[PDB]
Design a binder for these strands. Structure first.
Lengths: 147, 97, 195, 49
DNA sequence: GCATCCGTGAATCGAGGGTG
DNA sequence: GTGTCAGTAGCTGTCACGGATGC
RNA sequence: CACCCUCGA
């Protein structure tokens, strides 16, 4: 009947009231952190509910079984679990030159370098070349200025 | 803070799926509540969430309060380029301007 | 599971406590799973079944009383018989006084068991009769008894999801006009709290 | 009166008169007024921004 | 209807050095 | 997988003030 | 960068 599915609850709530507030302190001293201890306690008691082969023999210490569960979980966590952006001066000066050696170009070399042989409707050799000569013009201009 | 909240939320999903006792599910929802409360304004209710060294952790609302908050520290007064500082010395020969 | 924003709960004045007219401490008990709260109650079905529920509660109380009286009778008769028997043994009257006080002690314990049970039944019936939304039930055993007995008539819940439900079953405009009615004509003492 | 001003609230004496100016010309009752002294700390938090 | 207790707030800029 | 007692540190050595909170 | 210390007008 349903009284049994309620007996499960009334069995847990009857061990909580006697052992959770004490298990908490154990994990607290071992972690110095009441938040984790709060977590570890629920983890442990869930396992307890999941392992009824321990509480059945009421006459045997359950608390003693619980302490070891927690003590193990903490160390499981203690396994191998153990700025400012530069100033854009250079890059910007570099581009300020690159942009000054872009006006020294022809609109076709420009439209090509700003990107490919599928759009501009020309060969791949025309690409390779226009790229090639355009670069060399860029290199020439830059080194003309003394880069 | 976010990580603790996520841990408790995933545990809540586990408990709901596993049909854990109502006591555990409710006592876990309470902890999720407290953890989200800490995420938004740690220390507002009860004892603050202590970090390593019994140090209260900063929350999202702590990012905006007081002199170190965003408003007073990073909005009302910024730090500026093109500036310097040095010791002052009297210059009698100088003009007022 | 739904959760509450601490800014509107604990920030003074408690915004939620002002919205639902719930005390901040009562709200604290609700949110952090320290007390159940009634979300809804079918008052009409309760009105249509009140007579029958009253009769059944009365019969339960009478059963407690009858069992109590029978048990007390058994103990008192064994007391008289034991005193006569220890008198036949010739024991000194001081020993009989000891046994006498022991019997009175046991009978008092029996009557007090019965009295705690009777007062539990009284409280259960009183709470179910005067049951309204936004009520708090700090005693967990009491709420379990309420669901076990009259669960078909009301609905209750705990935590933040319960307050979510309370906000859902809330008429904003109606409460606003109620507060305005209190404002137009009221005592400063009870008018500031409404303002 | 006929304003939406919540009674007991502290409102700038410009918007008060400007709202009673519309309500007086609308037919409804203008909201009542009473001068109130606020501390600088309290007045600062009451700003519209 | 009133004492208690909660939460808010409390000068500005600047130097070096240590650890988590 | 776990199974006899098995159980915080730290700390109050700030203060004035207003108003929601609570007896 | 989180805190900490010591210091300067």
């Amino acid at each position: 009947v349903s009284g049994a599915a309620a007996a499960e609850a009334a069995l847990m709530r009857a061990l909580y009231d006697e052992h959770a507030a004490v298990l908490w302190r154990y994990a607290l001293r071992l972690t110095g952190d009441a938040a984790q201890a709060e977590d570890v306690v629920q983890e442990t008691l869930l396992r307890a509910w999941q392992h009824p082969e321990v509480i059945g023999d009421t006459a045997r210490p359950a608390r003693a079984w619980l302490f070891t569960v927690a003590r193990n979980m903490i160390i499981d966590e203690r396994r191998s679990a153990r700025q400012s952006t530069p100033d854009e001066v250079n890059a910007a000066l570099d581009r300020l030159l690159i942009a000054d050696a872009l006006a020294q170009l022809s609109a076709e070399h420009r439209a090509v370098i700003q990107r490919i042989a599928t759009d501009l409707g020309i060969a791949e050799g025309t690409v390779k070349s226009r790229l090639h000569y355009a670069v060399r013009a860029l290199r020439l201009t830059l080194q003309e200025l003394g880069v | 803070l976010y990580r603790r909240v996520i841990n408790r939320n995933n545990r809540l999903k586990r408990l709901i799926d596993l049909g854990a006792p109502e006591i555990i599910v409710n006592n876990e929802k309470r902890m999720l509540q407290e953890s989200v409360d800490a995420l938004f304004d740690n220390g507002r209710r009860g004892r603050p969430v202590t970090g390593p060294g019994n140090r209260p952790l900063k929350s999202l609302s702590d990012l905006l309060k007081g002199k170190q908050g965003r408003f007073r520290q990073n909005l009302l007064g910024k730090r500026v380029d093109y500036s310097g500082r040095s010791v002052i010395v009297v210059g009698p020969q100088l003009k007022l301007h | 599971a739904p959760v509450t924003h601490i800014w509107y709960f604990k920030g003074v004045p408690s915004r939620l406590g002002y919205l639902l007219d719930l005390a901040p401490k009562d709200l604290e008990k609700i949110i952090y799973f320290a007390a159940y709260v009634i979300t809804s109650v079918d008052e009409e079905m309760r009105h249509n079944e009140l007579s029958t529920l009253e009769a059944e509660m009365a019969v339960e109380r009478k059963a407690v009383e009858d069992q109590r009286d029978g048990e007390l009778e058994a103990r008192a008769q064994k007391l008289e018989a034991d005193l006569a028997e220890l008198e036949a043994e010739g024991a000194k009257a001081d020993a009989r006084r000891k046994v006498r006080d022991g019997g009175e002690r046991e009978m008092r314990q029996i009557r007090d068991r019965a009295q705690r049970e009777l007062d539990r039944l009284e409280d259960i019936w009183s709470t179910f009769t005067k049951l309204a939304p936004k009520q708090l039930i700090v005693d967990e055993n009491l709420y379990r008894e309420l669901v076990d007995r009259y669960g078909e008539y009301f609905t209750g819940a705990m935590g933040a999801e319960s307050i979510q439900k309370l906000i859902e079953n809330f008429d904003i405009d109606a409460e606003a006009e109620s507060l305005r009615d209190v404002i137009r004509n009221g005592k400063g003492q009870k008018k500031l709290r409404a303002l | 009166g006929s304003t939406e001003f919540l009674p007991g609230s502290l409102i700038d004496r410009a918007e008060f008169e400007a709202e009673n100016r519309r309500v007086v010309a609308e037919g409804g009752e203008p909201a009542a007024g009473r001068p109130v002294l606020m501390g600088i700390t309290k007045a600062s938090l009451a700003t519209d921004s």
